Amino acid sequence: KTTCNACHQ
Amino acid sequence: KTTCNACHQ
Amino acid sequence: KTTCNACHQ
Amino acid sequence: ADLEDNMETLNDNLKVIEKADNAAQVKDALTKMAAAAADAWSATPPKLEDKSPDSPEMHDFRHGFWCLIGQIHAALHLANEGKVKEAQAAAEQLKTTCNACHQKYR
Amino acid sequence: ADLEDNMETLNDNLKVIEKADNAAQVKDALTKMAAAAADAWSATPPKLEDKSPDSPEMHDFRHGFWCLIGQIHAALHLANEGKVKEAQAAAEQLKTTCNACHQKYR
Amino acid sequence: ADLEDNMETLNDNLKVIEKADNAAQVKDALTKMAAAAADAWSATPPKLEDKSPDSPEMHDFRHGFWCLIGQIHAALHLANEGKVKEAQAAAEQLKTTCNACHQKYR
Amino acid sequence: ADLEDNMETLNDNLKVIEKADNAAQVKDALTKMAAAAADAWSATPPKLEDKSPDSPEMHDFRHGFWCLIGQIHAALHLANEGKVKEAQAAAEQLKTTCNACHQKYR
Amino acid sequence: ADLEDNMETLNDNLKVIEKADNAAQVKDALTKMAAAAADAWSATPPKLEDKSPDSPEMHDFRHGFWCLIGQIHAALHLANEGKVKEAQAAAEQLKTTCNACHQKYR
Amino acid sequence: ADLEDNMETLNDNLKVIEKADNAAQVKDALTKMAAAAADAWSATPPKLEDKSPDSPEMHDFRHGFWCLIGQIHAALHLANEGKVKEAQAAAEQLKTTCNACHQKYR
Amino acid sequence: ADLEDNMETLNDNLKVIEKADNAAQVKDALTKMAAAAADAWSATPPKLEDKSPDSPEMHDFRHGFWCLIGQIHAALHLANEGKVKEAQAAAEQLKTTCNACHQKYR
Amino acid sequence: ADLEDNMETLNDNLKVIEKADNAAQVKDALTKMAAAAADAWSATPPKLEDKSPDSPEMHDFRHGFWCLIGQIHAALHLANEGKVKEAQAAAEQLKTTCNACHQKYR
Amino acid sequence: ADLEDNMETLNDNLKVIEKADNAAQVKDALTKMAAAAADAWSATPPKLEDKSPDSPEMHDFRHGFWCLIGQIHAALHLANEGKVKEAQAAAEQLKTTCNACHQKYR
Amino acid sequence: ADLEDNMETLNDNLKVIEKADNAAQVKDALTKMAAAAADAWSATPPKLEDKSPDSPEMHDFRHGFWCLIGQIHAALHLANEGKVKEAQAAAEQLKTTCNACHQKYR
Amino acid sequence: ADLEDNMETLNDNLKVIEKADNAAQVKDALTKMAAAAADAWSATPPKLEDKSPDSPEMHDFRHGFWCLIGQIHAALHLANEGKVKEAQAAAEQLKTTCNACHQKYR
Amino acid sequence: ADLEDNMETLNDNLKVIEKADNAAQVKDALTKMAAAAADAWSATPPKLEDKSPDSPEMHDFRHGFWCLIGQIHAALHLANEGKVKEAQAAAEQLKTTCNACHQKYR
Ligand code: HEM
Ligand code: HEM
Ligand code: HEM
Ligand code: HEM
Ligand code: HEM
Ligand code: HEM
Ligand code: HEM
Ligand code: HEM
Ligand code: HEM
Ligand code: HEM
Ligand code: HEM
Ligand code: HEM
Ligand code: HEM
Ligand code: HEM
Ligand SMILES: [Zn+2]
Ligand SMILES: [Zn+2]
Ligand SMILES: [Zn+2]
Ligand SMILES: [Zn+2]
Ligand SMILES: [Zn+2]
Ligand SMILES: [Zn+2]
Ligand SMILES: [Zn+2]
Ligand SMILES: [Zn+2]
Ligand SMILES: [Zn+2]
Ligand SMILES: [Zn+2]
Ligand SMILES: [Zn+2]
Ligand SMILES: [Zn+2]
Ligand SMILES: [Zn+2]
Ligand SMILES: [Zn+2]
Ligand SMILES: [Zn+2]
Ligand SMILES: [Zn+2]
Ligand SMILES: [Zn+2]
Ligand SMILES: [Zn+2]
Ligand SMILES: [Zn+2]
Ligand SMILES: [Zn+2]
Ligand SMILES: [Zn+2]
Ligand SMILES: [Zn+2]
Ligand SMILES: [Zn+2]
Ligand SMILES: [Zn+2]
Ligand SMILES: [Zn+2]
Ligand SMILES: [Zn+2]
Ligand SMILES: [Zn+2]
Ligand SMILES: [Zn+2]
Ligand SMILES: [Zn+2]
Ligand SMILES: [Zn+2]
């Protein structure tokens, strides 16, 4: 989840 | 949950 | 959680 | 909404679907139909107001809406894929279900 | 929740509805009933444990809950309109469904 | 997802449950199966395309999915309780329902 | 929704408010009216199709909807206080605004 | 809230803004003012009770609130940039608008 | 909000409750009171600004708000049941708690 | 829910914890107990209706619930860690608190 | 954002709409335009800095934005129906409104 | 988190507040402290393990955390106003409460 | 999901994209692919189990998924614009990345 | 947004940051930059449209945006702490990264 | 949080995992580590402040965190499956990555 959240949020 | 969601959502 | 929710909510 | 309100919604939105030229309009109309049919599912019609809930009649009445809901779902699946003509055809097919219940219970 | 727990929930909240004097209390109780029925519908009762999943008995069992859920919705619709006495009358009718399943399977 | 996609999802996740060694994996797989069955319920299979929506065949077809959804729910109830082996046994029993519908309509 | 469909929504919900016997029903109808009027506000009616956005007529047309929206809010405020008859009377007064615009632009 | 209560909200929060020493406090007060004014916009004041919704006075009354709401937004924009003194000065200028409406309709 | 702000909110909303003719107004007012009392709970009043947080005085001050919050909760429970007169009576009873703290610490 | 309803919820869920064989069931039951106690905290029991809100009896009464809420929290902390037997032991110990308040105020 | 930045947003998104080949792109651009115009609505431009909020010029300035916002909504409605070319033509007509305000106040 | 973990959280974040140069950092740290205190308040410390739940010692222990939570709120209120130095001063006062409980129970 | 499950998800959905005739289906499939890749990127494949985490082989392995995730985003961007054929062409390019990692590590 | 759109957003917001006098403006601008850079990460520039995704060139292109995103994150961290001058300096440093990629690939 | 704070979080939660006797505690600790590493990725350590953002040292530094995030993910995948001992072993192996980066850049 962490890589994804790093951009989106 | 599935029957309920089938209508509501 | 309960004491906290008692005020906030 | 009461039973008549829900029937008005179903009828109005069938007309919207028929005249529609875009998927958004069809999807929106079918969503409103789904909501209306779901609400009508637990209603008791004037001609069965004295009847048993476990009666062949109320069984059949409820079944009619469950059938309709399934068909609306199928049409909605098509509209979500942007398939206007196909979703309109699926909506047209609903009428047999509308009519069947009316013949018995309206 | 097991079947027994869900039955306790159904029973308690049906009693809450009878003694209720306001729409919110009736709505809360009905909401809790619908959730208990949603859990219970897929259970297998002790007296039907040795029966086939496609047996007339298990068909009938599941059907009883769907009937109950339908009736809870009719009661909820009335409570949402603030019609306390009408919702209460609708909830009393639920008991026919409770009784029918118990007579056969409890 | 179309009927075939939903079937692939059902088949794949049944295998996942079989090989699973933890509750989380079983829970996730059953959750995906429930969603696949819910989407498939409203579909019309090739061999029933010529049939009326109100036909005994189409009734029986839709019924199979709700039978399946119920059994998935019972399996998930067990999985949510951390009862992996019991949920796996329950998932194994699903195959009877898979097979029955296939024998008639696949 | 197109203009005609928004008008159907206004018309139907005015009838619902007239027949209503509870605050929830009036609130629901007024909420749908507010949404329909909000959509219609930026529409160009057939009879003003060749007219400029800054034309006297288009200013007047948009003002008609702002007028209606304000009155719907006033009625909504009454419904939210459970004042059914007062909200119904406020809804009845909307007709002046409906009629005035129709006389000019329908 | 009724008109009088919305006015109490406007009045109290104007005092809060005057005494404030931080942006958060000013922002909070202005946000509450915006909500009170938005509610009051569709109200009919005692002195205009027998007047038509389309009357010159009722147009003027509603315009007064739209005027105030616009200025509150301008002040809010300043508060959101942490410009405390500038936001306070914008709030002070609101009084012209408060007073003008009162002279006519309070 | 500061201590005085919260006291203004408590006082204003007690007045709103007293004059109210509907449950929505009473519920809204009590909700604002709950919020105000919750915020005032951790405040230090001018007369205790030199005192120990572990002092009999600050103990007692905080206790007063905890007491008030409990009483607001009880009134809120009644308002949620649509019981206007009963909730108004519960709000009236709050005044003893208001007064007790003022006598000691205002 | 009234005091009696909240007590029924407390009693029922204590039994659920006792018979439970999994963490999820224990967690759910304790969560319901916490919510029931939170609702009951603000209530006035029949035998203390004549007492002042600031009375030693009413202080002691409210105190019992926060004692109970704390112990429920400790039990749930154990249940969240999958420690079923320890959470069940902790739930058993709750009875002392149940009994103590009952002996005085039930 | 300040006025200049909101104008940059309006200008850039008008160019995006012109070059767009799909509904999503047009919808996205129009949505950003609506937000920029909404912010700019309550701004005071350099050339009207010494003017009163109730001045003829400031009324005219605010009206310009309300005019633009209405047209953006109309274009958005078209984009939401997937009518790319029609939405682009509606966006092109916005320029009249852009230019008219600039001639007076830029 | 166990008691030791929550104490580590309290200690770390109190140090973060001291070295902080901005409101956001102070607010984040205080938020983390409140959550740790919320978890810890229901724990039983090693030196009080053989004590009764209704003992003066356990009463005092729980009370210490409630005091702490109150003080964290006062510090949060200040940080939310962007008053870094005042919030920091309020956080230093927290240490009296830390010290008092440790002196007795650590 | 284990590595094998995630590979099954990748494979199934890549086939869904090829046979797709609408943007929604393509978007759904790509969304599912991104989630599978998000799970798989941190796995250790059987043929690299005895390798160091900082080995060229594990660097390359992780890198392959990041490449894949990047390409899925390019395909998603196109599907979000309703460009079915272009999104499908972009998805076919993904296969180069699939092939490259398999050639080395499968 | 396409590649050019995202570059316009990056350039515009760098200018907003340079001229900003408040943290809110800087934070908002940096957030828009983050979004733009994230979208540009999976784009293929005109000069590499014939190239391999696994090529030194496309590797390097993607790397440039990942680098930029990291730097925007660092600047955002500062803006969130209300540090205007420091965040502006961090934004200024971004230009080396902008320029490096342009030299190679623009 | 600054780099040092994030390191404290990493160090603390590693110890929590080591002493843990349940999956929930391991899951929570790893979740906090992931968030700390994600925040630290964009930082510039003291010993690399003089280095270019595009330097081999800064590349290697950022790389260490993504290596760490990947390993945390693999550990959490195991913890989510209730495999406490395996997740603890995986967390132990993290130290190699901690040490490697420290040896070069701490
Ligand atoms: C492996 C983790 C990731 C997953 C699972 C993921 C998934 C997705 C999905 C499914 C969408 C489509 C949203 C929709 O239209 O419904 C999307 C959009 C997008 N993603 Fe990702 N993504 C990940 C990582 C990233 C990263 C690292 C970046 C930045 C470099 C990024 C940047 C974007 C952007 C700019 C969009 C379009 C705007 C938006 O919806 O946010 N993603 N992502
Ligand atoms: C132990 C449980 C509690 C926790 C963890 C907690 C935590 C917090 C936090 C972190 C904030 C700051 C919100 C923000 O600005 O981001 C806050 C605000 C606040 N809290 Fe609590 N609190 C607790 C209990 C209480 C209680 C019992 C009361 C009432 C007596 C209360 C009353 C308030 C009020 C009035 C605010 C400011 C307005 C708001 O954000 O709700 N809190 N709380
Ligand atoms: C989409 C399909 C349907 C359409 C378009 C439709 C439409 C209508 C319309 C326009 C009315 C007249 C309402 C009025 O009297 O004000 C009506 C009445 C009625 N409909 Fe339907 N209907 C549909 C489906 C159904 C189904 C499936 C059932 C039974 C399961 C049903 C049962 C009834 C009954 C009992 C009435 C009489 C209501 C009354 O007199 O109070 N309808 N319907
Ligand atoms: C709202 C209506 C209902 C009420 C108030 C109700 C109430 C109850 C109660 C109080 C029990 C005893 C639980 C115990 O052992 O502590 C029970 C048992 C049972 N009920 Fe219901 N019930 C209702 C609906 C139904 C329905 C619809 C069915 C079947 C479709 C059903 C089937 C059963 C069965 C099989 C048992 C035996 C449980 C066991 O021994 O494991 N009930 N019910
Ligand atoms: C968990 C139980 C089930 C499993 C594992 C399963 C599996 C499958 C599989 C692997 C296929 C072949 C898909 C393909 O052609 O690519 C299939 C096809 C099919 N299944 Fe199922 N299925 C299950 C339940 C059901 C049920 C309950 C029904 C009926 C109510 C059903 C009706 C069908 C039909 C009609 C097809 C043919 C689809 C077509 O040719 O378009 N299935 N199933
Ligand atoms: C609640 C008040 C209103 C009601 C009940 C109402 C009702 C209706 C109805 C039933 C129609 C016929 C739709 C059809 O062709 O099927 C209609 C048409 C129309 N109405 Fe209204 N309306 C209301 C308010 C307004 C207002 C305030 C305006 C102007 C500001 C307006 C402008 C129009 C126009 C221009 C048409 C013709 C649409 C066309 O031919 O395409 N209406 N209205
Ligand atoms: C921020 C600016 C404003 C402030 C501070 C303010 C304040 C007040 C106050 C304190 C009252 C007395 C309420 C009471 O009886 O307890 C009042 C009444 C009133 N205000 Fe305002 N007001 C403002 C804006 C406006 C505007 C813009 C209008 C007209 C568009 C307006 C119209 C009225 C009317 C009609 C009353 C009489 C209410 C009644 O007697 O029922 N006010 N105002
Ligand atoms: C609902 C019940 C209450 C009402 C209606 C109320 C009302 C008020 C009012 C109108 C003021 C004057 C504010 C001002 O000087 O501007 C005030 C002041 C004050 N109140 Fe209350 N109050 C209530 C409850 C309490 C409680 C429970 C406490 C203590 C636990 C308390 C402590 C104080 C203190 C210390 C002041 C003086 C503030 C100052 O001078 O800065 N109040 N209150
Ligand atoms: C888990 C612990 C508890 C359990 C299992 C429990 C159970 C019960 C039960 C079964 C009743 C009878 C309800 C009825 O009349 O229908 C009751 C009544 C009552 N309980 Fe509890 N209780 C608990 C905790 C407490 C606590 C902590 C207090 C006081 C702080 C309390 C105060 C009361 C009171 C005042 C009544 C009488 C209600 C009335 O007659 O209106 N209980 N309790
Ligand atoms: C979509 C239509 C519009 C477009 C494309 C547009 C574009 C622009 C541009 C590019 C600028 C120069 C900004 C700069 O200095 O960098 C500008 C300035 C300005 N515009 Fe607009 N604009 C539009 C609508 C409007 C409207 C409707 C108004 C008046 C109601 C308006 C009022 C102004 C003013 C007052 C300035 C000068 C700002 C200053 O010097 O501080 N604009 N516009
Ligand atoms: C913000 C204020 C506080 C701070 C900074 C703080 C800090 C600490 C620290 C660093 C430890 C050592 C933990 C370890 O063994 O690694 C500790 C232990 C302890 N603290 Fe606190 N604490 C605070 C508040 C409190 C309060 C209010 C109480 C009692 C109501 C308390 C009771 C204890 C106890 C009983 C221990 C022993 C834990 C054990 O050995 O299991 N603390 N504290
Ligand atoms: C969208 C592109 C991809 C597709 C369609 C795909 C498909 C597959 C399939 C169908 C399998 C066989 C799974 C099974 O045993 O049932 C597999 C295995 C495997 N793939 Fe992929 N894959 C893709 C991307 C990748 C990438 C990018 C990597 C490396 C970075 C990779 C590495 C592997 C490995 C190591 C296995 C062996 C799994 C095992 O035996 O445990 N794959 N792949
Ligand atoms: C914040 C830093 C950046 C700024 C301010 C910036 C700004 C710009 C601007 C203003 C343009 C002209 C757009 C046009 O032709 O309409 C452009 C083009 C371009 N930029 Fe950037 N950029 C930045 C970062 C980057 C990075 C990091 C890369 C590569 C990794 C990059 C690659 C490109 C490419 C390939 C073009 C040519 C686009 C085309 O001709 O279609 N940029 N940039
Ligand atoms: C789970 C693995 C890790 C643990 C347990 C850990 C622990 C620590 C600790 C306890 C400190 C001392 C903090 C202080 O001075 O107060 C520290 C400092 C530091 N660590 Fe880590 N660390 C880990 C991973 C990493 C990684 C992967 C990197 C590089 C990619 C890294 C780079 C640094 C740097 C540069 C410092 C010096 C910070 C400064 O002096 O400002 N750490 N670490
Ligand atoms: Zn209804
Ligand atoms: Zn109609
Ligand atoms: Zn029946
Ligand atoms: Zn259950
Ligand atoms: Zn019970
Ligand atoms: Zn069957
Ligand atoms: Zn589907
Ligand atoms: Zn049928
Ligand atoms: Zn529309
Ligand atoms: Zn105009
Ligand atoms: Zn109001
Ligand atoms: Zn008018
Ligand atoms: Zn405050
Ligand atoms: Zn006041
Ligand atoms: Zn104390
Ligand atoms: Zn209650
Ligand atoms: Zn007291
Ligand atoms: Zn702005
Ligand atoms: Zn004016
Ligand atoms: Zn804990
Ligand atoms: Zn620490
Ligand atoms: Zn005690
Ligand atoms: Zn996985
Ligand atoms: Zn598959
Ligand atoms: Zn490495
Ligand atoms: Zn884009
Ligand atoms: Zn620009
Ligand atoms: Zn590569
Ligand atoms: Zn940070
Ligand atoms: Zn680099």
Swiss-Prot record, chains D, E, F, G, H, I, J, K, L, M, N, O:
- The entry marks the following residues as binding heme b, namely M7, H102
Residue span of region Disordered: 38-60
Query: One GO molecular-function annotation for this sequence?
Result: heme binding
Q: Which UniProt keywords apply?
A: Electron transport, Heme, Iron, Metal-binding, Periplasm, Signal, Transport
Listed GO cellular component terms? periplasmic space
Function of this protein? Electron-transport protein of unknown function.
What family does the Swiss-Prot or TrEMBL record give for this protein? Belongs to the cytochrome b562 family.
Q: What is this protein called?
A: Soluble cytochrome b562
What species is this protein from? Escherichia coli
Gene from which this protein is expressed: cybC
Q: Which residues of the full protein are shown?
A: 23 to 128 of 128
